[PDB]
Design a protein around this motif. Structure first.
Motif, PDB file in Angstrom:
ATOM      1  N   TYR A  96       0.807  -1.213   0.000  1.00 29.15           N
ATOM      2  CA  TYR A  96       0.000   0.000   0.000  1.00 29.15           C
ATOM      3  C   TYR A  96       0.843   1.268   0.000  1.00 29.15           C
ATOM      4  O   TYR A  96       0.394   2.298  -0.516  1.00 29.15           O
ATOM      5  CB  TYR A  96      -0.954   0.007   1.196  1.00 29.15           C
ATOM      6  CG  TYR A  96      -2.146  -0.903   1.010  1.00 29.15           C
ATOM      7  CD1 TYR A  96      -3.049  -0.688  -0.022  1.00 29.15           C
ATOM      8  CD2 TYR A  96      -2.373  -1.971   1.866  1.00 29.15           C
ATOM      9  CE1 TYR A  96      -4.138  -1.515  -0.201  1.00 29.15           C
ATOM     10  CE2 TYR A  96      -3.461  -2.803   1.696  1.00 29.15           C
ATOM     11  CZ  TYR A  96      -4.341  -2.569   0.661  1.00 29.15           C
ATOM     12  OH  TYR A  96      -5.428  -3.393   0.486  1.00 29.15           O
ATOM     13  N   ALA A 145       0.575   4.584  -4.512  1.00 31.23           N
ATOM     14  CA  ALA A 145      -0.140   5.541  -3.669  1.00 31.23           C
ATOM     15  C   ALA A 145      -1.240   6.213  -4.493  1.00 31.23           C
ATOM     16  O   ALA A 145      -1.183   7.393  -4.844  1.00 31.23           O
ATOM     17  CB  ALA A 145       0.825   6.561  -3.085  1.00 31.23           C
ATOM     18  N   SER A 146      -2.266   5.425  -4.793  1.00 28.22           N
ATOM     19  CA  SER A 146      -3.358   5.839  -5.662  1.00 28.22           C
ATOM     20  C   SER A 146      -4.594   6.186  -4.843  1.00 28.22           C
ATOM     21  O   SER A 146      -4.872   5.554  -3.820  1.00 28.22           O
ATOM     22  CB  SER A 146      -3.692   4.737  -6.668  1.00 28.22           C
ATOM     23  OG  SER A 146      -3.692   3.464  -6.045  1.00 28.22           O
ATOM     24  N   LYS A 147      -5.331   7.201  -5.300  1.00 25.85           N
ATOM     25  CA  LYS A 147      -6.591   7.546  -4.650  1.00 25.85           C
ATOM     26  C   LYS A 147      -7.608   6.420  -4.776  1.00 25.85           C
ATOM     27  O   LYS A 147      -8.430   6.225  -3.873  1.00 25.85           O
ATOM     28  CB  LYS A 147      -7.153   8.841  -5.238  1.00 25.85           C
ATOM     29  CG  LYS A 147      -6.118   9.936  -5.436  1.00 25.85           C
ATOM     30  CD  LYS A 147      -5.857  10.678  -4.135  1.00 25.85           C
ATOM     31  CE  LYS A 147      -4.691  11.644  -4.261  1.00 25.85           C
ATOM     32  NZ  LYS A 147      -5.096  13.035  -3.918  1.00 25.85           N
ATOM     33  N   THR A 161      -8.416   2.340  -4.788  1.00 27.68           N
ATOM     34  CA  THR A 161      -7.951   1.233  -3.949  1.00 27.68           C
ATOM     35  C   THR A 161      -7.057   1.724  -2.810  1.00 27.68           C
ATOM     36  O   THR A 161      -5.962   1.211  -2.572  1.00 27.68           O
ATOM     37  CB  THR A 161      -7.231   0.178  -4.787  1.00 27.68           C
ATOM     38  OG1 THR A 161      -5.858   0.551  -4.942  1.00 27.68           O
ATOM     39  CG2 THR A 161      -7.869   0.049  -6.159  1.00 27.68           C
ATOM     40  N   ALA A 162      -7.535   2.744  -2.104  1.00 23.34           N
ATOM     41  CA  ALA A 162      -6.803   3.214  -0.936  1.00 23.34           C
ATOM     42  C   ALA A 162      -7.067   2.285   0.247  1.00 23.34           C
ATOM     43  O   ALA A 162      -8.201   1.844   0.446  1.00 23.34           O
ATOM     44  CB  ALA A 162      -7.210   4.639  -0.579  1.00 23.34           C
ATOM     45  N   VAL A 200       0.570   9.141   0.901  1.00 31.67           N
ATOM     46  CA  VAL A 200      -0.197   8.073   0.262  1.00 31.67           C
ATOM     47  C   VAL A 200      -1.620   8.113   0.806  1.00 31.67           C
ATOM     48  O   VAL A 200      -1.813   8.249   2.023  1.00 31.67           O
ATOM     49  CB  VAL A 200       0.461   6.700   0.485  1.00 31.67           C
ATOM     50  CG1 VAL A 200       1.410   6.747   1.668  1.00 31.67           C
ATOM     51  CG2 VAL A 200      -0.588   5.611   0.674  1.00 31.67           C
ATOM     52  N   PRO A 201      -2.638   8.027  -0.051  1.00 28.13           N
ATOM     53  CA  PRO A 201      -4.022   8.071   0.438  1.00 28.13           C
ATOM     54  C   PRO A 201      -4.335   6.910   1.371  1.00 28.13           C
ATOM     55  O   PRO A 201      -3.914   5.773   1.147  1.00 28.13           O
ATOM     56  CB  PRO A 201      -4.854   7.995  -0.847  1.00 28.13           C
ATOM     57  CG  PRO A 201      -3.936   8.457  -1.926  1.00 28.13           C
ATOM     58  CD  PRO A 201      -2.569   8.006  -1.520  1.00 28.13           C
ATOM     59  N   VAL A 202      -5.093   7.211   2.424  1.00 28.68           N
ATOM     60  CA  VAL A 202      -5.591   6.218   3.368  1.00 28.68           C
ATOM     61  C   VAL A 202      -7.011   6.610   3.750  1.00 28.68           C
ATOM     62  O   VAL A 202      -7.297   7.792   3.968  1.00 28.68           O
ATOM     63  CB  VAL A 202      -4.694   6.120   4.624  1.00 28.68           C
ATOM     64  CG1 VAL A 202      -5.330   5.225   5.671  1.00 28.68           C
ATOM     65  CG2 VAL A 202      -3.309   5.608   4.267  1.00 28.68           C
ATOM     66  N   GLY A 261      -5.891  11.263   1.608  1.00 26.65           N
ATOM     67  CA  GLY A 261      -6.881  10.381   2.185  1.00 26.65           C
ATOM     68  C   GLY A 261      -8.133  11.119   2.614  1.00 26.65           C
ATOM     69  O   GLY A 261      -8.381  12.267   2.243  1.00 26.65           O
TER      70      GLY A 261
END
Ligand SMILES: [K+]
Ligand SMILES: [Mg+2]
Ligand SMILES: [Mg+2]
Ligand SMILES: [Mg+2]
Ligand SMILES: [Mg+2]
Ligand SMILES: [Mg+2]
Ligand SMILES: [Mg+2]
Ligand SMILES: [Mg+2]
Ligand SMILES: [Mg+2]
Ligand SMILES: [Mg+2]
Ligand SMILES: [Mg+2]
Ligand SMILES: [Mg+2]
Ligand SMILES: [Mg+2]
Ligand SMILES: [Mg+2]
Ligand SMILES: [Mg+2]
Ligand SMILES: [Mg+2]
Ligand SMILES: [Mg+2]
Ligand SMILES: [Mg+2]
Ligand SMILES: [Mg+2]
Ligand SMILES: [Mg+2]
Ligand SMILES: [Mg+2]
Ligand SMILES: [Mg+2]
Lengths: 155, 185, 222, 148, 53, 51
Positions: free
Chosen positions: D89, D93-95, D97-98, D120-122, D142
């Motif tokens: 993950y 670091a994609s919006k 599949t966060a 990274v988006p979360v 995120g």
RNA sequence: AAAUAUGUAAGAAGUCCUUGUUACUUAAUUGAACGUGGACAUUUGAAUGAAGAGCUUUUAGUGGGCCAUUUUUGGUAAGC
RNA sequence: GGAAUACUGCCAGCUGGGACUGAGGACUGCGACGUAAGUCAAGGAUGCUGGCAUAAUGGUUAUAUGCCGCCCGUCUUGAAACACGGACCAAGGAGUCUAACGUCUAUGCGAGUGUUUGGGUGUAAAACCCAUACGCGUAAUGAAAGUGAACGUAGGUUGGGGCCUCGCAAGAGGUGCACAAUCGACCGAUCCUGAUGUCUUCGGAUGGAUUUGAGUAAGAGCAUAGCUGUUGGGACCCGAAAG
RNA sequence: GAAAUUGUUGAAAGGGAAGGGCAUUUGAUCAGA
């Protein structure tokens, strides 16, 4: 186990002594001990006897003679610290004492010793008899009388 | 009699051997005693002294602390030496590749270092690689971060964490802690 | 390869060179002492002949011996004794005379006998009871190599160099004196010459300035 | 154990290390916290300020479960993700599949913003969040989802 | 003293090599010759006791 | 191992102070002083003998 | 108006030269404080000494004292 | 006028007698003499000789002699006390264990730690294995509602071990963990200021303060064990008059 | 089958205590070489 023997034991290897700087230099005997001097024996079976000093031996002992004919003290060794050197001197020029040494005295009486005693005594009597009362002096034993002070007395 | 200007028969006050009976720690102490005696490198002497230290004198050194020390200008390739335990720290997300010598590594710290591509070596391995402590960087954990430390020096106007079993309202907060009840400290 | 003969021969050569330096230095010191003593004598004679009085230069050096035990000493004199390194009865030190040290001697007068040491007294003290403080240890001055290894940076190569630096209060007198361990003297061999030690020397006692008689006292104590 | 105590070492010494003048008496200063205002006042004011008196308002029948709210700072924010999936993950670091982090299921009630997280988006599910924690999560791409 | 020492050090490193910038305690007096010209010594004696009250 | 005193043990005295040999050979401890005949002034003598 | 006792100082955390910050201060880059840069180590600025210095924690016993010189109070005085 | 002598001091001047000591244990060193071999009084005793070969030396013990020596324990400023306990001997006889803790130390693991409430298992109170919880720690602050820890290479300055570079060395420069001082920044409380917006009374951005917190500022704790110390317990042992 | 305490035998000492310390004489006894 009764004592649970120690983990380490001292080694039984005797280490050599380090080199000792003690040379055996010749003894410096006091100036009163000159051959021919009459000495008083302070100890021994002949304590108190007056004897004649002779050749100085290599074991630091003094070779002395009575003379044997005079007072019965034979040719024998004596310790320098156990005699009093008097101021009476007989001449030892003519007495041959080169034969007598530590090996000569190294441990009934030997006929050789009797003969050398006679040889030395002959010259000793010859030299003594030119001094009046010297034979009687050497025959008489020294002793301290009442009032004698050895720190003041002269010998 | 002698008019002594100092206490007689005073012990140095410093450890000369670990209090521990760890045979491996004693072996390390022997090795670094030899090195300190016969190398004249100050690193060996300070490592030998650090090996004697007690647990509270060997606070853990986190991998994040190691990374911050390696971010020092010119220290990127130095061998990091920690005489103690190296612990993991998930708060740092980028660990550099390096060589760390330590008494002990936490499983997580060793995993992080190895995954970053470095090696975790023992103090005797460090001794063999750098007998004079060449290119070394000694790190020490925070000593005064201990729980016990904040209670030290407790007293009026010290602000020094009173020794207390339960904390909250009704627990040592009214008289002597605020001006409305008598006085404040 | 031998690395034994070509090293021992070089060490013997260096030792011989050091001994030659020490010999010439000692000869120069002897000449200096002789010249200074005869100059003082002749200056006194010339002043008398001219009808003046030659006032000798005040003494630059004193030797101080603690003659009192360690019990019942007031704090200020006790501290001064400790700072002069007289922490034991019959211990002695050399003190360079200034106002600062004269006031210390004034403070500790009832517990010490001090005076002006002669060359003979200093030489005998250093020869018989001379110990250097080396790595906080009392090491006897049995060889010139010790003195060179500890005072060489100040130009002191031998025991006679040390004695010269003591008697003539030189630039490095402080270092030489502090290198010298406090002399541990015995009690005087002929006694103190007085029934009671603990009144002033002027009052028939033993303490205070006994200026020239310190030589006789220290010699009997050595 | 007893063989290592100082009382074995005090055998043969009459006072047992308790002194000849002042002995070991029963309770010379009173029992327990006696005299905390009178003769132990110095030792109470020092080392225990605030001990005496009242400081707030009471709360009858207080239940700690009402105030159960474990705090998790942003500085970790990732130990809640399994170790193996953490690398997968952090990469990508994609919006889309966060990774979704249920902080309540992990056992926390409030998310605080102490540390900083990688960019990274979360997707953070929390009962409560601090303003700065939400600001840093959003700055990392995120979002915070409020749950109950 | 600081200013004087700085000035003395500068003049020393300009003229030669000598500084002696440390104070020293009062030293023992050196030898001196005292003349009797116009200063012949006058002999004093202790005075006898008297009351003069 | 054992402190040997100079002012005795001429060997140790010569190990220290190599000039001791020259001092002893030249007898510098008993050196004769050059004779002089300066006489004290009459004022010095009068002051000394003054009552 | 002493003597004794007593505060402070005897340097690199210093001195000197140039000029950066400020919402303080000045009529004013005026000053104040903190700074950047530059120069000065043999005695880096008296003596002596320094079984080193600095720092921390935790605990025992003690919390009846008495004597001597000196200063001194009450008391005629006291081994008060 | 020329000496002498006294007194004081110096000699790395010579030399006699006496006493105590003989530590160390291959060589290494510094020296001296000797042209050099080598020798030596030069980093600690060797050489020669005698008697005895056992109660002779010595140990133990009894006694004698010379000198010294008050009865221990305790309280006390002060005890041999005309202060108290003790006629004697044997056996017993007094700081223990526990709950909860402070410091320090050892050990295991370490942002986690604690298997042993319980379950499984067992050669059966042992040993071995284990889930979910729970305790403590990882966050504090406020009475509380509540809010909640990076301007910065998690800061600047000073000192700082170690390390790095140059230098034969001395030293010079760089980096500087822990730690110490100080100025800052951040979080909570208090006192202020009060933007967009608006259920027009809510909200609280932003900027501040001689205020305050047992805080943050690349975690240290958890568990076991030990001495010591604390509290409650009979609480080191014995002891009331009383209720 | 201890000690306190006691009898006998043996040894020793003993002018208003006894006991003890250092040192040695004397008597008894004894280890080591
Ligand atoms: K008490
Ligand atoms: Mg002693
Ligand atoms: Mg006599
Ligand atoms: Mg007398
Ligand atoms: Mg005791
Ligand atoms: Mg008692
Ligand atoms: Mg010795
Ligand atoms: Mg009391
Ligand atoms: Mg004479
Ligand atoms: Mg015997
Ligand atoms: Mg008596
Ligand atoms: Mg009383
Ligand atoms: Mg008593
Ligand atoms: Mg009485
Ligand atoms: Mg009573
Ligand atoms: Mg009774
Ligand atoms: Mg019993
Ligand atoms: Mg009862
Ligand atoms: Mg009642
Ligand atoms: Mg029976
Ligand atoms: Mg019986
Ligand atoms: Mg009778």
């Amino acid at each position: 186990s009764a004592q649970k023997a120690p983990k380490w034991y001292p080694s039984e290897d005797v280490a050599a002594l380090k080199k000792t700087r003690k040379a055996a230099r010749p003894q410096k005997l006091r100036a009163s001990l000159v051959p021919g001097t009459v000495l008083i024996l302070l100890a021994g079976r002949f304590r108190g006897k007056r004897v004649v000093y002779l050749k100085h031996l290599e074991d630091n002992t003094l070779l002395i003679s009575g003379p044997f004919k005079v007072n019965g003290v034979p040719l024998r060794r004596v310790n320098a610290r156990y005699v009093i050197a008097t101021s009476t001197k007989v001449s030892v020029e003519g007495v041959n004492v080169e034969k007598f040494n530590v090996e000569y005295f190294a441990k009934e009486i030997k006929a050789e010793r009797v003969e050398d005693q006679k040889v030395v005594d002959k010259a000793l009597i010859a030299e003594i008899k030119k001094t009046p009362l010297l034979k009687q002096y050497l025959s008489a034993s020294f002793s301290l009388k009442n009032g004698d002070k050895p720190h003041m007395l002269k010998f | 009699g002698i008019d002594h200007t100092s206490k007689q028969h005073k012990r140095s006050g410093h450890r000369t051997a670990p209090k521990s009976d760890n045979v491996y720690l004693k072996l390390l102490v022997k090795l670094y005693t030899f090195l300190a005696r016969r190398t004249d490198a100050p690193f060996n002497k300070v490592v030998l002294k650090a090996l004697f230290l007690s647990k509270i004198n060997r606070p853990p050194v986190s991998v994040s602390r190691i990374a911050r020390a390696l971010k020092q200008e010119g220290a990127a390739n130095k061998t990091v030496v920690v005489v103690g335990t190296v612990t993991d720290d998930a708060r740092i997300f980028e660990f550099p590749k390096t060589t760390v010598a330590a008494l002990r590594f936490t499983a997580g710290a060793r995993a992080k270092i190895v995954k970053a591509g470095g090696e975790c070596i023992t103090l005797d391995q460090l001794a063999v690689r750098a007998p004079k402590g060449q290119n070394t960087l000694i790190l020490r954990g925070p000593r005064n971060s201990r729980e016990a430390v904040r209670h030290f020096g407790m007293g009026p106007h010290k602000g020094k964490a009173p020794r207390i079993l339960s904390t909250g309202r009704k627990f040592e907060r009214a008289r002597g802690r605020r001006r409305s009840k008598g006085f404040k400290v | 390869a031998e690395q034994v003969a070509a090293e021992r021969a070089a060490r013997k050569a260096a030792n011989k060179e050091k001994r030659a330096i020490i010999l010439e230095r000692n000869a120069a010191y002897q000449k200096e002492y002789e010249t200074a003593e005869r100059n003082i004598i002749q200056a006194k004679r010339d002043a008398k002949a001219a009808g003046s009085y030659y006032v000798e230069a005040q003494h630059k050096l004193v030797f101080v011996v603690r003659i009192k035990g360690i019990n019942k000493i007031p704090p200020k004199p006790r501290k001064v004794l400790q700072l002069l390194r007289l922490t034991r009865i019959n211990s002695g030190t050399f003190v360079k005379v200034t106002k600062a040290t004269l006031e210390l001697l004034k403070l500790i007068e009832p517990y010490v006998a001090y005076g002006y040491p002669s060359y003979s007294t200093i030489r005998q003290l250093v020869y018989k009871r001379g110990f250097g403080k080396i790595n906080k240890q009392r090491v006897p001055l049995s060889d010139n190599a010790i003195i060179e290894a500890n005072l060489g940076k100040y130009g002191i190569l031998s025991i006679d160099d040390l004695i010269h630096e003591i008697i003539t209060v030189g630039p490095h007198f402080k270092q030489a004196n502090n290198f010298l361990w406090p002399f541990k003297l015995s009690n005087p061999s002929g006694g103190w010459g007085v029934p009671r030690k603990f009144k002033h020397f002027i009052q028939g006692g033993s303490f205070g300035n006994r200026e020239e008689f310190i030589n006789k006292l220290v010699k009997s104590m050595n | 154990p007893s063989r290592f105590t100082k009382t074995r070492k005090h055998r043969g010494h009459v006072s047992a290390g308790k002194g000849r003048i002042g002995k070991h008496r029963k309770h010379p200063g009173g029992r327990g916290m006696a005299g905390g205002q009178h003769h132990h006042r110095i030792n109470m004011d020092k080392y225990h300020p605030g001990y005496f008196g009242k400081v707030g308002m009471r709360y009858f029948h207080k239940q700690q479960a009402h105030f159960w709210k474990p705090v998790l700072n942003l500085d970790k924010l990732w130990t809640l993700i399994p170790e193996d999936k953490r690398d997968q993950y952090l990469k990508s670091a994609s919006k889309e599949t966060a990774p979704v982090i249920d902080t309540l299921a992990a056992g926390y009630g409030k998310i605080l913003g102490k540390g900083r997280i990688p960019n990274v988006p979360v997707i953070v599910k929390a009962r409560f969040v601090s303003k700065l924690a939400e600001e840093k999560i959003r700055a990392a791409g995120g979002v915070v989802e409020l749950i109950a | 003293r600081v200013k004087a020492n700085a000035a003395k050090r500068a003049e020393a490193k300009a003229q030669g090599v000598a500084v002696q910038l440390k104070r020293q305690p009062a030293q023992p007096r050196e030898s001196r010759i005292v003349s009797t010209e116009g200063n012949v010594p006058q002999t004093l004696a202790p005075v006898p006791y008297e009351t003069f009250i | 191992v054992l402190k040997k005193n100079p002012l005795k043990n001429k060997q140790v005295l010569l190990r220290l102070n190599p000039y001791a040999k020259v001092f002893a050979a030249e007898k510098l401890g008993s050196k004769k002083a050059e004779k002089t005949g300066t006489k004290p002034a009459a004022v010095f003598t009068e002051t000394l003998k003054h009552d």
